């Protein structure tokens, strides 16, 4: 509704931002190497792949950015 | 008053219940004294045994609650040691040494407890291996192992348990491939019923973390690697990988159904703490995505629901953080979202025996566990009863 | 296995190692130098003798297999089976 | 506080008998019959001054401050001071 839209653009100012940080927490978390976090020796713990793990792990931060 | 013969019986065989009980004893000693929300129990870790040692999982003992078999994965870093560790805790006398240390010769993965023997540890490892551990003799190599043959154990059994109690126990080795085969709770010689699971297509399902729904019948769910998570069994012609609970958005890695039904409604209902990162509800008979819980930072592994409290759990992320949800009480915010010291991917995440204790299997090695008086088992059935309802609606409108 | 099981027990709190005397009064296992521990084990165990015939004659089943001897200063705590005696000192910390 | 003192030990766990020794361990004060507080008090008495003198042999400037034997069936916490040297028959929960 546009009279309670009026008010949620308001809030808009505000989520758009916090959505912006949560984008570039992504680009962080996505610069950040698979080897780097410890998911290379859990998915040696869980018997997943390591390179598998990193490319799994870059789509859902795919998934996340959709 | 000379110690050559004294040394030689040393060197002998006689000692071996004697250095058990000097370590049990000299434990019992260990808290020296004197005469004249989480509440965070105790970290484990010990010394030697536990530096280097990715967590498998935290299996709970049935006799002698507050014992946990702190089963480590042999991490990369210690290819010359043992490969794979395990280890008993007493949980109350507040030691920082273990009370048994039990390690391997195959990577230890899901190792549990032999039921109704205090005196015994078997689990299985990487190569689906279940090993027996004697606890009577100090010898910390497996006494038993089991053969390591091609349709014997060979892939990771991360689900070793048996089926109910020790009537008709079945503890079947559920791998990373379906090679299920059944066991007693005793004897390891030849699987009871050595046979393998089938999927869909390509069986080689890597089940990870999984758990049976509140009844603890044979079905169990599938920690598949690649969602759409799955239901079978061992028993007869059950040992099918079929019923897809397709919605999810990344390996099945932390999957634990309702527990025991005490305060809360049946419901059926496992919720999957995996790669998708936003934690998903499922229940036995939805086919959807229950409820999607927080988006978590990083890799997901483990979750648990509290034997006390059937209904909530605790999920965890990538970057070391215990997202502990109630779910009968809120839906969208968790109890105590703690953070795991540091930043890693937390591997296990498994409820006390007893109940209301969250012990995570940290990084390598130490175990640190939350210990809490908040998760207790609220009388709420017909609110989650509705909860599971209104999400299982919200699944898909 | 003796170095995992004196490690681990040396890992407490003042614990100087597994020195177990025999039931003769004879210090059969030594983590120590050899005289010292082998004069104080050896009266130890003639006393605990004594104290084991104290104790079942005062408590008919008490196997000694625990039993912290606070001193002043020092616990020659003793945790082992009924048979042997270990002979550690720690202090009452 | 004396009688108060003795059932509030003695509801502990599984306490068998306490009393905090007079001189010799023989007081009026009897938890139980004459054996098991006063001739076993006694006997934990002089054989507990005899494990003083064990420590004493091995260290002579070191008496005793407590004694700890939590097995079976029994926790005897003996403590000997000043005047007392404590005396405990327990059970092991």
Known sequence: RPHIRGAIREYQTQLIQRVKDDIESLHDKFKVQYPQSQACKMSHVRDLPPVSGSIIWAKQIDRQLT | ?397 | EVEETLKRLQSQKGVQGIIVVNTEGIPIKSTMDNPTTTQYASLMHSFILKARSTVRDIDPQNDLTFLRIRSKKNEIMVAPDKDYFLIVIQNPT
């Open chain 2, 1 to 397: 008053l000379t110690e050559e013969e004294k040394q030689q019986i040393l060197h002998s065989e006689e000692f071996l219940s004697f250095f058990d009980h000097s370590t049990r004893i000299v434990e019992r000693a260990l808290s020296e004294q004197i005469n004249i929300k989480l509440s965070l129990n105790r970290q484990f870790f010990d010394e030697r045994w536990s530096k280097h040692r990715v967590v498998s999982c935290l299996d709970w003992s049935s006799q002698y609650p507050e014992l946990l078999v702190a089963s480590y994965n042999n991490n990369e870093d210690a290819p010359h040691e043992p490969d794979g560790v395990a280890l008993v805790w007493n949980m109350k006398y507040k030691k920082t040494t273990p009370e048994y240390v039990f390690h391997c010769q195959s990577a230890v993965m899901s190792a549990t407890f032999a039921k109704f023997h205090p005196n015994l540890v078997v689990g299985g490892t990487y190569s689906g291996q279940i090993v027996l551990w004697d606890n009577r003799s100090n010898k910390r190599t497996p006494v038993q192992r089991t053969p390591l043959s091609a349709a014997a154990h060979t892939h990771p059994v991360y689900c070793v348990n048996v089926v109910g109690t020790q009537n008709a126990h079945n503890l079947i080795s559920i791998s990373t491939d379906g090679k299920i085969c059944s066991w007693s709770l005793d004897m390891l010689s030849h699987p009871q019923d050595s046979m393998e699971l089938v999927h869909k297509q390509s069986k080689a399902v890597a089940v990870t973390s999984m758990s049976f729904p509140v009844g603890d019948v044979n079905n169990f769910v599938v920690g598949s690697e690649e969602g759409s998570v799955y239901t079978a069994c061992r028993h007869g012609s059950k040992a099918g990988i079929s019923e897809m609970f397709e919605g999810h958005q990344g390996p099945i890695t932390g999957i634990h159904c309702h527990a025991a039904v005490g305060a809360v409604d049946f419901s059926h209902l496992f919720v999957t703490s995996s790669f998708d990162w936003t934690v998903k509800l499922w229940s036995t008979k939805n086919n959807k995505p229950l409820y999607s819980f927080e988006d978590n930072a990083g890799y997901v592994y483990d979750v648990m629901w509290s034997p006390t409290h059937p209904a909530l759990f605790a999920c965890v992320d990538g970057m070391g953080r215990l997202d502990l949800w109630n779910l009968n009480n809120d839906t969208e915010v968790p109890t105590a979202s703690i953070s795991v010291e540091g930043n890693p991917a937390l591997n296990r995440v498994r409820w006390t025996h007893s109940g209301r204790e969250i012990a995570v299997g940290d990084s390598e090695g130490q175990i640190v566990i939350y210990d809490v008086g908040e998760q207790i088992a609220v009388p709420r059935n017909d609110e989650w009863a509705r909860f599971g309802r209104t999400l299982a609606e919200i699944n898909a409108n």
